Symmetry: D2
């Protein structure tokens, strides 16, 4: 059911500071190597007046290399799939809520994504597009109330140097009951490899691997 | 432009824990008395699987009695109108983002509302519908970056007694430049006066008054 | 047990960003009128390198005017007294934890106070002494697990204009069993009425009154 | 200045929910291997009425294995030493502020530690001593305003299963000017290896290693 090489299909509908937009994407990846890439196209609301970086971690933990000694919640959840919900709380009060309902059709994951950001100040690095990239990160995953939670405090590096912090709170929900993992981590590194001037086209990559921390 | 008796017409589109819904409303109010009421009807996604109370403060600070000695940001903002953005962060990690774009057509305010809540635990008072009402509240308003901010830490009373807290952070953006007020407060009291069994129909009231705190 | 005119004696021991200090105070107040004042003297760690204002709300809800229909948790607690704990979470990450153990000797309240703030940025308004005063506030009080909680989102006005926001979280613990009140509010207004240049001497006032929100 | 085998001596003075206590410790470690251990003995305020685990991460990032390609803020700071401040914000509102002033005497680091926790609910896992251990963690470290910051969201495992979250926010301050590192991480694993019944004696270990994230 999960192949060494899978495809990605997605559409995001959303708004930032009340201004709506829509983006579609097509991609591919290797679930067992924890690598994926995709091409994203702004379909409505362009040119986006906010930093594209706030969207990229919304554009699937099945693309993560899990060692055998860590129960894999995400690969278990297919073919039925899973959904996830997330709050991304930035240190200047800007907050983005996002959801992704992930289904599987043949060799293609299909994402239905909603994205809603509020309270980004006009002079902040998001509305002024002063972000460079997400730093690499280490997400902490743990079970609560029969579902899987993922917490990570990460940051975006800024143009003049320095960092703009964001607290992630994700809830992962398999559509069918699967074996629940113990406390573990997922190392991430997400990168915009290329983009045109107004980010109408974005080539996005992510590399992720699970581990259990220092012994 | 601001008349003693005004109407309200609205539509909210949104989702809670990824499940979409839509609600429409009609109402009326007296902006100079700070009172309003409305009838709300679920149009899509019913019956709502979550506590209706999380929606009610999203269903307009123009309906607030402002004394003469306190600058009224909201009544100034019309006829053009204003918009607002808000995050409502509950103490168990449930978080709701909402926007309202408010325009004026004759004597009727028109609301275009988006509402998105996530991370409400299945065990929680929201998803299990254990909330009774919002307590009265006192919102704090202050200027930042040429717009008006509103912060308030309030709570919902629960079925078994006790309270479930929520931190509101609102940003108010007048569509054209208006005079900015000093630090002040707005007392709120919102109540569902009636509803049918699954809250497909809700009659909602709010009373709000601005003041400058002690003294008096 | 609580006479119309009472006295205040206190000692605060504490630290800010690892720098220790100590302050003593003597004062007086009217519990039923909700008013108090005191003179405070820095004994150790002077001259204080941080904004004095972060200390002032730590320098007793017995000094709050309670209406007859709102149960008074604090006046009930004496002669035995009560204690409280508080986190004050400022918007730039500076955090002050404080405790006050309040006893009664004759007509004098005695406070034993601890205060510890960390992570105040060197360039912030606290370490650069850019605060003007606390705005008036409205605290929300409610019962949790048999004790009394107090939440308030308030702010300090800044020298260059604007406000520096702070979230208060207080737990009030009566030393004896008392009647618990319903959800209610206390309006505050604390003011430094006078001070010398480096705040070695400070005359501090507070006015507070409880209420149940709208209406009136 | 930093030798492969060094000693540790510390004293912590502090309070939890307003109840004061004191602990002293002697230990040893290998700064270049990122490993340390110590024996801690409660001197005042025993038996401790709260979960000992909230103290353990307060009981020195010089004990972290830094690869050659990541600037070592902490080893640079000696012989003068450094200080740090930290807030530990637990998900149920319990908050601990802590400071450590670290000096060097010969081959022995000397810690002067203050620790203050407030608002831990009586029925929570801390006051009820339901914590088992800290999970391993990954701290993230970054420069701000010329000093070093460390944020990590980690958790304690609980006796009945499940986890108890805590947000760490640390500021590290070298007493002298050192070279500042880029954004990086430190993996931690702290463990109580042994303790007596009321935790009057505790044997504590920590293993820590710096890295720059994926890959490797």
């Amino acid at each position: 059911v999960i192949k060494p090489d899978m495809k990605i299909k997605l559409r995001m509908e959303g708004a930032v500071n009340g201004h709506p937009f829509a983006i579609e994407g097509v991609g591919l990846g290797k679930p067992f190597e924890g690598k994926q890439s995709m091409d994203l196209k702004v379909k409505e609301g362009g040119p986006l007046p906010f930093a594209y970086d706030i969207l990229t971690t919304v554009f699937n933990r099945v693309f993560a290399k899990y060692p055998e000694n860590i129960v894999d919640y995400f690969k278990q959840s297919f073919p039925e799939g899973y959904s996830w919900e997330r709050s991304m709380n930035y240190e200047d009060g800007g907050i983005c809520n996002a959801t992704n309902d992930i289904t599987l059709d043949g060799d293609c994951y299909i994402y239905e994504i909603r994205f809603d950001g509020v309270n980004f100040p006009a002079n902040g690095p998001v509305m002024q597009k002063r972000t460079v990239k997400w730093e690499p990160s280490t997400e902490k995953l743990y079970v609560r109330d029969g579902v899987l939670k993922g917490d990570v405090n990460t940051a975006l590096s800024l143009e003049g140097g320095g960092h703009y912090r964001c607290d992630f709170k994700t809830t992962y929900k398999a559509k069918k009951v699967v074996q629940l993992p113990d406390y573990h981590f997922v190392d991430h590194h997400i990168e915009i490899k290329s983009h045109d001037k107004d980010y109408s086209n974005v080539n996005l990559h992510e590399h992720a691997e699970a581990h259990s921390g220092l012994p």
